[PDB]
Amino acid sequence: MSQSNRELVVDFLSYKLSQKGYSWSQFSDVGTESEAVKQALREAGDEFELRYRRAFSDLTSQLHITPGTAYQSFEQVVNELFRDGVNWGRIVAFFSFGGALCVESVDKEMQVLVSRIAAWMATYLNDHLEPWIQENGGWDTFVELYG
Amino acid sequence: QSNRELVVDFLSYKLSQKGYSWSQFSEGTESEAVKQALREAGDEFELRYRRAFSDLTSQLHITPGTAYQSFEQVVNELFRDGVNWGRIVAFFSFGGALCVESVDKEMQVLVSRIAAWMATYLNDHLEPWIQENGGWDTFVELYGN
Amino acid sequence: DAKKVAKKAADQAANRIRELAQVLVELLKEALKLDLTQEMRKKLIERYAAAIIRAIGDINNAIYQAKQEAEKLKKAGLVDSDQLDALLRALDELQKVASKAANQLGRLFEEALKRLDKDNGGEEEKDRTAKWFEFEARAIAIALTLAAIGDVFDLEKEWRKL
């Protein structure tokens, strides 16, 4: 499910970037069921962020993202997020976190980071979350659970 | 005075259940119905609390110097975004647990203080909602057994 | 049934906040260590951020499961439309109060760290700020547990009214 997982990351980040007025195409040169999955994840991300906006700018601000330090900051936080297991809420939180890091990157004129974060997120999804996702019925489970 | 009398009745009951006499530390029938319903609701609230979260009194930080903040900070957070009868029951139960914990730690002087703080918060910040929602008689109708 | 749906959701969400409060207090104590390398300070911030994000993800997980159980009960005809409405509003209220508690705990941790850094002084001022943070975090955790019991208790009495 590897290429589908990259498309999911790109769709979600493109959406979050557009909510802040930013255009994916400037940072990167990158059926029915994929559309349902993308839409459920955009909506869950919106709902997660609804009651965590200006204070989850705070967290990302506290990490002091820079091109030299972003990878370890991203990976250490994600490793702790999933250290004792996976559930759909944590996966939504993972997407939202990586979205917040991309927005912060563009705000700080560190646009090179957008395509890197997307790569790191797709790699993590495919290497460390896809086994759990598949044993929990695939992304269609998420579409049903969210609605 | 009716709200003061509810606080005293409830605390007297909760202290008695934990082994202490209120006498150590300090309409007629309509008031009994309200007092009895509140005692029963607090009993049920405390059962539910213990089943979900275990012991309440031992988790309450309190010294004489910080007691006002222990009471105020919890109560303000409890009612921060609104009021319902269940949160009013929670307020009484919390106050009863804070008094028991105070006595358990040989801080008996705090029981009367906490009762006064509770009566003041009821009269100043909950009575408008209570009266708007049918008064304590509506609480009896909804919660009394 | 419906009562277990609401109870489970409330208990999970309140327990995630109690756990977050505990994690943050432990992280603030580590930040008090006085031969703390930067190497560690960066890891403390990362653990802070992950604890906040974990707590809110887990709160949301409990809420989404509970709303799916609520709709299954509507379909199986174990709840009517007005009871389902009361349950969904209670779950939205639970999500709102637990998410507020998580943001407040995070903000108080960030203020504590700053007082530890900027407000400079003996351990006394600084260890005061630690015990203040722990006092405030416990108050938030207690208040949320009390609201969780009270709101489910009142939901049940609302269903009886209906």
Using the beta-carbon criterion (under 8 Å), do A77 and C58 form an inter-chain contact?
Answer: no
Helices (H), chain B: 2-17, 22-25, 28-53, 67-78, 85-104, 109-121, 127-132, 135-143
Among B125, B126, B74, residue whose Cα is nearest residue B95: B74
The one-letter amino acid at C106: G
- A75-109 as b/e: b if 16+ CB within 10 A: ebbbebbbeeebbbbbbbbbbbbbbbbbbbbbeee
Q: Decide if C96 touches A, using CB distance below 8 A.
A: yes
The continuous run of DSSP H or E covering B63 comes out as: none
Q: Decide if C11 touches B, using CB distance below 8 A.
A: yes
Residue B110: helix, strand or coil by DSSP? helix
When CB atoms are compared, the residue of B41, B52, B93 closest to C11 is B52
> For residues B22 and B8, what is the distance between their CA atoms, to the nearest angstrom?
8
Domain segments of chain B as ranges: 1-145
Does B contact A via 3+ CB–CB distances below 8 Å?
no
Among B145, B131, B111, B124, residue whose Cα is nearest residue B8: B111
Q: Decide if A145 touches C, using CB distance below 8 A.
A: yes
When CB atoms are compared, the residue of A76, A77, A90 closest to C57 is A90
Do B30 and B137 touch, CB atoms closer than 8 A? yes
Structural domains of chain C ordered from first start:
2-161 (1.10.132.20)
The one-letter amino acid at C32: L
Among B87, B94, B73, B69, residue whose Cα is nearest residue B130: B87
Q: From residue A76, give the alpha-carbon distance in Å to each of A93, B8, C56.
A: 15, 53, 18
Listing DSSP states for A7-71 in one string gives HHHHHHHHHHHHHTT--GGGT----HHHHHHHHHHHHHHHHHHHTTHHHHHHHHHHTT--TTTHH
Task: Residue C54: list chain A partners with CB under 8 A.
Answer: 80-81, 90, 93
Using the beta-carbon criterion (under 8 Å), do C160 and B142 form an inter-chain contact?
Answer: yes
> For residues A31 and C110, what is the distance between their CA atoms, to the nearest angstrom?
44
Contacts of A9 by beta carbon, 8 Å cutoff, 6+ apart? A95, A98, A118, A121, A122, A125
Using the beta-carbon criterion (under 8 Å), do C145 and B94 form an inter-chain contact?
Answer: no
Task: Residue C97: list chain B partners with CB under 8 A.
Answer: 80-81
Q: Decide if C50 touches A, using CB distance below 8 A.
A: yes
Q: Decide if C40 touches A, using CB distance below 8 A.
A: no
Cα-Cα-Cα-Cα dihedral sign, residues A42, A44, A45, A50:
positive
Using the beta-carbon criterion (under 8 Å), do C135 and B69 form an inter-chain contact?
Answer: yes
Q: Which technique?
A: X-ray
Do A68 and C120 touch, CB atoms closer than 8 A? no
Cα-Cα-Cα-Cα dihedral sign, residues C153, C16, B76, B13:
positive
The continuous run of DSSP H or E covering B19 comes out as: none
> For residues B23 and C134, what is the distance between their CA atoms, to the nearest angstrom?
34
Q: Decide if C157 touches B, using CB distance below 8 A.
A: yes
Q: Decide if A136 touches C, using CB distance below 8 A.
A: no
User: What's the gap between Cα A144 and its chain centre?
Assistant: 20
